Amino acid sequence: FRNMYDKYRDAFLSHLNEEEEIKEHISKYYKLLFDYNCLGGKNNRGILVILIYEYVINSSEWEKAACLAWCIEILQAAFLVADDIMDKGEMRRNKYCWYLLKDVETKNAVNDVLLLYNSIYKLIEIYLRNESCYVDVIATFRDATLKTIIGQHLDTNIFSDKYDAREIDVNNINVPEQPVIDINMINFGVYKNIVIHKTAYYSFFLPIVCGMLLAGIDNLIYKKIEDISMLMGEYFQIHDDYLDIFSDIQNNKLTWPLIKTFELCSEPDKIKIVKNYGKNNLACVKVIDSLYQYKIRKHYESYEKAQKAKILSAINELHHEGIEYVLKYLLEIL
Amino acid sequence: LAFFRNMYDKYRDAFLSHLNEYSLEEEIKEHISKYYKLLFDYNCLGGKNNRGILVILIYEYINSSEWEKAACLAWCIEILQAAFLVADDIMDKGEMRRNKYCWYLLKDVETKNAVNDVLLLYNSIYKLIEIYLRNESCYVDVIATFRDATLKTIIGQHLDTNIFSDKYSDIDVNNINVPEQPVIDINMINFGVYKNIVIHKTAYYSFFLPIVCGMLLAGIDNLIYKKIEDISMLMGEYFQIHDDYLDSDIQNNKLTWPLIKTFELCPDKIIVKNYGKVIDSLYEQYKHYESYEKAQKAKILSAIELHHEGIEYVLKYLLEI
Ligand SMILES: CCCCCCCCOc1cc(O)cc(CSc2ccccc2C(=O)O)c1
Ligand SMILES: CCCCCCCCOc1cc(O)cc(CSc2ccccc2C(=O)O)c1
Predict the structure, then answer these.
(1) Residue B227: is it exposed, middle or buried by C-beta count within 10 angstroms (0-12/13-18/19+)?
(2) Which of A136, A278, B220, B300 could serve as A252's disulfide partner, Cβ 3.0–4.6 Å?
(3) How close B171 comes to chain A (CA, Å)?
(4) Nearest ligand (C-alpha, residue A79)
(5) Which of B213, B74, B79 is nearest to B139 (CA)?
(6) Which parts of the sequence bind Mg(2+) 3 (chain A) (predicted)?
(7) Which domain holds residue A238?
């Protein structure tokens, strides 16, 4: 996989490359945009396409599968660039975030998101325009992205001022909304709504469905895969929330640990939480951290056991030895 | 007409419905709606709608089902326009757009949302086209037209943003310290480059796309598309240049027509010390626009050798308005 990279980068660079001085500057820039942001990640989404396809093969077919696999990694790159803009991040994959670079800046990074994003659909035209799944593939990418955009919306706004059912001041361009958690949003239903949309569709559903469509599978097994994907996304974002404890607390994010602590702590501790969650002051966080007291460590281990079981149960009702093997596999390496 | 402007709520609500069919909780769905209805309303309405009407005109030159599909494409262009405006304002750090505050400036919105909202508006387009034209034979071609124009636009934007920048000289992935102070580069101050920028940044999506949209839906592939591409390239220029004439362009260190015309014509070049912060008085110093508009209008009418009385009429018409 990691070998095929240059081929797809260059095919798109080629597309762009049809005044000479200008063409040359464009290339130096866009090659870096690709290299800087597409390489360096673990590539789980990418390999998943290749694995699922394999288990459901001449060189031409790999060419097409590896294309889809790389298009996922591009999508990922686009999301990381955008998310770092939005969250005002510092570090990503142990380098500076793209937008932070003096030769890049926020102005270019925005434009670059749209570029990466659209690059995907061009590469799919180059390699799969004639395949019968073509239209379905481009649709999968579109629908997964839309779901991701909504999941991102929610994650950004769940505790925000705009969330009665007061509307938006199209005249207030000044003053800020003193980041303040909203106890009404601190429940599992909402969290799942965010986590499923923000991560499950593009991290699991998309790659699997890509590998399945190319292979010729529409059939009632896609909805089975959607549900497994929903389950995996949760299992997994929640894992991530467990680690980012050992910026989210100051970044005022809805996390699993936050919700578990809330449904579990005494009416007086809930108030401490509200006074310290998301605020700048270090005493405030050193303290949420100490509330995590309710042995969140242990409550995770309990959830991981139970959720892993829910995931395996749904996989065994799939009736496809090849896909079952891959998903059992990914659930070990995820 | 304002028949077009009437169809608006239908397409906005179709896409809002799509969202409202997601696996979410009712309270959450309600907030989502409130927000996205505003994103559409605030950014899609208020414009002149030339790109929109162009689709409807070209197509016309018809039962209700056909309008439904053509007005879809027409609105999709206006949504595209909305997304480009939102994005451009973030990039150029703008203040006012259509005589209100820019979307991203709003305290309930901020840069963090606006970015995400550009992607949402953009993708909304392709969903609307699935809804209204999934079964049409031109479907695949239509979605590609939108894709290719966007890509050209994106490149045009890249150029417009960077033509005078530090990296364009005869990238440091470790420098994150406030950017270099902006300086024009005399090497870039020529017509070739400017047409490169203006063609890509505006011509494909403002002219080519809406015309090709009206053409594909109508059943025209044929060798007349490349004719339309060229007219479209020409109009793009004719028109960005007009906008340069009305023109914070000097202040924003932008490559403009007046800048290039003055440069090829003017010790005065050493412009370099004041552009991007008297430039104004260098312009009244050196009428040349009125000369170009007469010549370019002629070049455009001459190309409209199209052999199609219906299309020719509309293009002659748009060139007036
Ligand atoms: C339109 C707005 C875009 C919204 C998209 C939000 C993106 C955040 O969702 C994520 C959540 C996670 O838990 C993990 C990851 C990637 S794994 C990863 C993580 C860090 C570094 C490298 C990698 C790597 O393997 O490539 C993504
Ligand atoms: C993602 C890459 C970023 C893309 C950036 C593309 C730049 C888009 O900005 C513009 C370009 C133009 O050539 C003209 C206009 C104003 S026309 C207009 C203005 C306000 C209302 C209605 C209209 C109308 O003619 O319908 C704006």
Answers:
(1) middle
(2) A278
(3) 7
(4) 1
(5) B213
(6) 240, 244, 248
(7) 1-334
The rounded distance, in Å, linking the Cα atoms of B310 and B299 is 20
How many domains is chain B built from? Answer: 1
Our CA dihedral for B203, B77, B130, A131, rounded to 10 degrees, sits at: 10
**Does residue A117 belong to the interface with chain B, where contact is any CB pair within 8 Å?**
yes
Q: Do B25 and A190 touch (CB under 8 A)?
A: yes
The residues in A 169-188 lying below 8 A from B, measured between CB atoms, are 169-177
Decide: A246 and A300 in contact? Cβ < 8 Å.
no
| Helix, coil or strand: residue B84 | helix
Residue A99 structure tokens: 């937008």
The two three-digit tokens of residue A171, written as one number: 């005249």
Q: Please report, for residues A163, B22, B172, B228, B298, the alpha-carbon distance to residue B31 in angstroms, rounded to integers and kept in the order given.
A: 7, 13, 43, 44, 53
Q: How many CB atoms lie within 10 A of CB B237?
A: 22
Method: X-ray
Q: Is A84 annotated as a binding residue?
A: no
Is some CB atom of chain B closer than 8 A to the CB atom of A138?
yes
Q: Are A204 and A197 in contact (CB under 8 A)?
A: no
CATH number for the domain spanning A122: value is 1.10.600.10
Q: Ligand 2, residue B46: give the atom nearest the CA.
A: 21
Instruction: Evaluate whether B57 touches B318 at the Cβ level (below 8 Å).
Output: yes
